Amino acid sequence: PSTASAGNNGPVCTGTDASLSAGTVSGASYAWYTDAGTSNQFSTLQNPTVNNLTNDSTFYLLVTVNGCPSALDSTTVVVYPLTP
Amino acid sequence: PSTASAGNNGPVCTGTDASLSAGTVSGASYAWYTDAGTSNQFSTLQNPTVNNLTNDSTFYLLVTVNGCPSALDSTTVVVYPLTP
Incomplete structure (x- = not known):
């Protein structure tokens, strides 16, 4: 399968x-x-919601069709700076 | 396939x-x-959202059906002038 490119909010x-x-x-x-390393799955949803982000972080994904995984697709969730 | 003509906002x-x-x-x-040249794919979505446009830019597309691509379809996103 092709990569069903991941986004965020x-x-x-x-x-x-x-x-x-x-x-x-x-x-x-x-x-x-x-x-x-694709070893710690945390979600099977198409639109998983992450929680309490305090700094930048990344998540990965692997769209599987007919039992065959796509290439790994990373996504990042840029947290905004701190308002002084 | 015929061209699924691209637009923008x-x-x-x-x-x-x-x-x-x-x-x-x-x-x-x-x-x-x-x-x-159709060499740098950035999106597999039907409705991809672009980001931070500061000047006019173009994007391309290639609707594939049964493994066969359409002709290349360019689209442009006219950025408005600068309010003085």
Whole structure:
């Protein structure tokens, strides 16, 4: 499968929540991982919502169709600076 | 496949975001490129959203059905002038 390129909800105010978003493939199962090694799956949703982001972080994904995974697709959720 | 002619969200205030929009083909996969040579794919979405446009720019597309690409379809996102 091709990569159903992942997005997010833009800059996240430090301390609040974020959403991740996979693109839509009609036959796909989705899986999100917290690590590039694709070993710690935290979500099977197409649009998983992350929580309490205090700094920049990355999530990964691997759209699977007919049992075959896509290439790893990383996404980042830029947290905004701190208002003094 | 025929060209699923691409659009956008109209003139973009200098410094803000824009959307791109492919037309809907029931069997199509979509791919957007940043270069006429169709070598630097940046999006697999039907409605990819671009970011921080400061001047006029172009994006391309190539609706693929049954593995066969359409002709290249360019689109432009006119950024509005600067308010003095």
